[PDB]
Symmetry: C2
Amino acid sequence: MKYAGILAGGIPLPKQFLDLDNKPILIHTLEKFILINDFEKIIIATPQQWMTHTKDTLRKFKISDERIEVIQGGSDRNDTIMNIVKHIESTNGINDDDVIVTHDAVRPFLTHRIIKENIQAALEYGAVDTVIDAIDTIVTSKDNQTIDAIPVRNEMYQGQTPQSFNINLLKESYAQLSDEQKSILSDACKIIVETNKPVRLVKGELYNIKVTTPYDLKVANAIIRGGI
Amino acid sequence: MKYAGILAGGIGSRMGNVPLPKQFLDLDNKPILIHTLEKFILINDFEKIIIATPQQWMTHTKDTLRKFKISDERIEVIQGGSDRNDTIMNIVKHIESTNGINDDDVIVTHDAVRPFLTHRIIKENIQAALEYGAVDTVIDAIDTIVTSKDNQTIDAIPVRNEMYQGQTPQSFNINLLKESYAQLSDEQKSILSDACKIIVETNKPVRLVKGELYNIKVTTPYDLKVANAIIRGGIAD
Ligand SMILES: Nc1ccn([C@@H]2O[C@H](COP(=O)(O)OP(=O)(O)OC[C@@H](O)[C@@H](O)[C@@H](O)CO)[C@@H](O)[C@H]2O)c(=O)n1
Ligand SMILES: Nc1ccn([C@@H]2O[C@H](COP(=O)(O)OP(=O)(O)OC[C@@H](O)[C@@H](O)[C@@H](O)CO)[C@@H](O)[C@H]2O)c(=O)n1
């Protein structure tokens, strides 16, 4: 069993529901996952305020895949992931070989190739990240004023999503973490990295952007029009 | 004295059936290099605005300046270097052999292929270079940043709050830049990807100036589609 977890639990209307070429970003994203028959369930987690509106939007764009379920998101991004996990466990349980492909609702340009690679690398190695090589030199700062270090750019990668995990592995490593450890995370693959278990790399795409600021939405509107 | 070093070097010899190199390709009917150069021209603080370019492209650069009626005597076209930092040092050697280097000189280095920098960015670079001697133009990382030493598996995922996308300009006190460059071995030089790591390898500080999300580097066709959208929708306004 392969499960898809569309993360839309973050807070005009929230960015995930904004129109990209007369169509909510969430719909753009979800269409990619619908085309993959391998998914047992495609779960959209969203704030309680926006659950009925999400289901209205699905209806409005004539999407009625019974594989789709809308559930309530979490405190933080990782908590939303864990809510989707708890939903799967309390409705059909967790096989010890099940994987979940978590993906940002605001990353509507992921590709069929990206998803299929994610699922096969999760089946093989248990934890997967979607990245692209750093184009900018990457810099670090421990004070937001002066540089701390400038690593070898060759070893730096822009982390995207999907991020796909073995559900048992993800739950066990999340339980290993403290509340302080959890609070400093920014993605889900550091759950696995912090517990000293491997994370394979899948290559994303340069156009697999996160659409949150208005600048991003103009880039996304150009990517749509120019068929990128 | 404050100097601008527009980096348009390292363009390899190319056949005529390939489009023009990225620095010279048209963006809204204007070479990207000209878009970049216009911002520096508007700043009177600069004693010279030096464009370094491969030997093959010097005459074409000067034709291009003429074509867009650019006749600022502060602009000079010189031959670039073997690598990016070598191009910077060529600009330094030009400055020193034409005006000398005063100990209060700063140079504002910038990729010709980042045409969307702003007046704000350049001014902050100049003055932060005067105060702290070395400056990087960066933006807070939006993606989580990851490291891998084998292109297969992750080694580490640092705290994103401390990670930054390095952009340009990069601005230095010229003597400081020269001294720290002279300290480096050829191996160290070969592994650098920017100019601020010259200063960082020699354990001297580098101040941070915040850039802009549209201060993108135009190299791939994808970037040119993004850059045409930035132009059309007036997002650098
Ligand atoms: N309580 C919450 C908060 C947010 N969300 C969803 O999560 C998506 C991204 O959220 P956001 O746009 O704000 O970006 P983040 O700072 O969280 O980092 C992400 C970054 O790490 C990653 O894309 C990649 O880079 C790693 O490889 C959005 O769809 C939100 O709806 C959720 O479901 N519940
Ligand atoms: N012999 C050479 C080689 C390159 N150049 C110029 O350098 C510009 C960018 O070059 P390139 O697009 O190829 O990318 P780089 O690998 O050099 O990285 C840059 C990255 O570090 C920086 O933008 C930022 O991210 C860090 O803060 C281009 O205008 C080239 O003409 C030169 O004049 N002479």
